[PDB]
């Protein structure tokens, strides 16, 4: 075989050539924080949350896109890696709105969780925030674009898995706005998985909207019956009542998606 030897925090691990730094750290059991990266989409590299230090290299590398080189010692808990994560989380939470109580994603938010795990605990942003016009992309996906962190998982999903090519970023700079540019209704058969792979509350479920909250829900692992695919699902219930239906990851049926009928 052709497995090259890389080091993650000093520990040796053998990886295939073409393996990214994030997957090399995954093979030793360490999950690098990420917002734009998703292992079933393509690689964007445009949130800079996976910025990890390679030692003897005076610049942090984006671990989601950088292929490993032979002999790299990946420093996942070093000083400049933690400073990179805290600074990038500071810029992510600079213009982000204080909607955590009135947001459906609270308690199931990646931005909250790895702000708690990897960010700082207080703000230096002494300015006014942006506010983005909310879009109407259908009766299923509630859209509050002020909460968007522009990770472009919308666009990669609709371009690569949904196969729609109707989501995208309009504008430039801090005024860059993910949308359709027109009052267009994003109705694919898989239009509800952008609710899943939105890491923030910019895309929530409109039927599930405001009704529950993820920590009080009891997770039942069940099967779809709406088609003969047999999509493995999570039926989350709260006090004996079905709140929503989330997918289960199964590599041979429904990779981590479900259809809009199932959802």
Partner 1 sequence: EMVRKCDPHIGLLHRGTEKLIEYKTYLQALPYFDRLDYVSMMCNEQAYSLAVEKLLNIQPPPRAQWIRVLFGEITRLLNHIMAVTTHALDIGAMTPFFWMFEEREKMFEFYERVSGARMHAAYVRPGGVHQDLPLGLMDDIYEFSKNFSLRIDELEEMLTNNRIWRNRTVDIGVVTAEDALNYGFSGVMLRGSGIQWDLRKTQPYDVYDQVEFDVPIGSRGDCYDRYLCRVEEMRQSIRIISQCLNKMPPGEIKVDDAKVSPPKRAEMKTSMESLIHHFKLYTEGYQVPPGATYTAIEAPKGEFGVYLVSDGSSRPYRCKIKAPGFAHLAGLDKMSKGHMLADVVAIIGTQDIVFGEVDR
Partner 2 sequence: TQLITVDEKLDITTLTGVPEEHIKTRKARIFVPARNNMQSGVNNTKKWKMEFDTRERWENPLMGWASTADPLSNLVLTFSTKEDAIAFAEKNGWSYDVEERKVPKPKSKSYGANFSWNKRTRVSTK
Partner 3 sequence: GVRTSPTGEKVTHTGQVYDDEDYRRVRFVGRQKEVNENFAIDLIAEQPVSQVGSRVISCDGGGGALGHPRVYINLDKETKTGTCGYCGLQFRQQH
Give the residues lining the site for ligand SF4 (CB under 6 A): 96-97, 99-101, 103, 105-106, 109, 111-112, 147-154, 178, 198-203
Alpha carbon distance 97, 146 (integer Å):
7
Give the one entry of K ion, partner 3, ligand FES, none that residue 48 binds, where binding means its C-beta sits below a cut-off of 5 to 8 angstroms depending on kind. ligand FES
219 lies in the site for partner 3, by CB under 8 A:
no
30 lies in the site for partner 1, by CB under 8 A:
no
Give the one entry of partner 1, ligand SF4, partner 2, none that residue 13 binds, where binding means its C-beta sits below a cut-off of 5 to 8 angstroms depending on kind. none
Q: Strand, coil or helix: what is 52?
A: strand
212 lies in the site for partner 1, by CB under 8 A:
no
Sole binder of partner 3 in the list 15, 50, 74, 132 (CB under 8 A): 132
Give the one entry of partner 1, partner 2, ligand SF4, none that residue 10 binds, where binding means its C-beta sits below a cut-off of 5 to 8 angstroms depending on kind. none
* CB nearer partner 1, residue 116 or residue 223: 116
Dihedral over alpha carbons 246, 108, 162, 164 (to 10 degrees): 130
Q: Strand, coil or helix: what is 174?
A: helix
Alpha carbon distance 177, 149 (integer Å):
10
* CB nearer ligand FES, residue 45 or residue 138: 45
Q: Which residues have C-beta within 8 Å of that of residue 153, sequence separation ≥ 6?
A: 36, 38, 41, 44, 194, 197, 198, 199
Binding positions for ligand FES, 62-101, rule CB under 6 A: 62-64
* CB nearer ligand SF4, residue 150 or residue 232: 150
Each residue of 196-231: b (16+ CB within 10 Å) or e?
bbbbbbbbbbbebeeebebeebeeeeeebeeeeeeb
The two beta strands, 177-179 and 232-237, are unpaired
Q: Strand, coil or helix: what is 129?
A: coil
Give the one entry of ligand FES, K ion, partner 2, none that residue 38 binds, where binding means its C-beta sits below a cut-off of 5 to 8 angstroms depending on kind. partner 2
148 lies in the site for ligand FES, by CB under 6 A:
no
109 lies in the site for partner 2, by CB under 8 A:
yes
Name the nearest CA neighbour of 220 among 251, 191, 198, 242.
Answer: 242
Name the nearest CA neighbour of 41 among 190, 147, 183, 185.
Answer: 190
Q: Which residues bind partner 3 (CB under 8 A)?
A: 97-102, 128-134, 146
Q: Which residues bind ligand FES (CB under 6 A)?
A: 34-37, 45, 47-50, 62-64
């Amino acid at each position: 075989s052709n497995l090259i030897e890389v080091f993650v925090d000093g520990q040796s691990v053998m990886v295939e050539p073409g393996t990214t730094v994030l997957q090399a750290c995954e093979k030793v059991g360490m999950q690098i924080p990420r917002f734009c990266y998703h292992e079933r989409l393509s690689v964007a590299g445009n949130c800079r949350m996976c910025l990890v230090e390679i030692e003897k290299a005076p610049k942090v590398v984006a671990a989601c896109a950088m292929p490993v080189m032979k002999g790299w010692n990946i420093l996942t808990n070093s000083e400049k890696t933690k400073k990179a994560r805290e600074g990038v989380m500071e810029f992510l939470l600079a213009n982000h709105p204080l909607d955590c109580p009135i947001c459906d994603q609270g308690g199931e938010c990646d931005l909250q969780d790895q702000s708690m795990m990897f960010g700082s605990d207080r703000s230096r942003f002494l300015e006014g925030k942006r506010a983005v016009e909310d879009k109407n992309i259908g009766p299923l996906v509630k859209t509050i674009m002020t909460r968007c962190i522009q990770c472009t998982r919308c666009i990669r999903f609709a371009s690569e898995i949904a196969g729609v090519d109707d989501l995208g970023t309009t504008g430039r700079g801090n005024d860059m706005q993910v949308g359709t540019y027109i009052e267009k209704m994003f109705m694919s058969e898989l239009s509800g998985n952008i609710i899943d792979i939105c890491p923030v509350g910019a895309l929530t479920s409109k039927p599930y909207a405001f009704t529950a909250r993820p920590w009080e829900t009891r997770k039942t692992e069940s099967i779809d019956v709406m088609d003969a695919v047999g999509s493995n699902i999570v039926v989350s219930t709260r006090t004996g009542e079905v709140m929503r239906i989330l997918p289960r990851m199964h590599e041979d049926i429904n990779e981590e998606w479900i259809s809009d009928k199932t959802r």
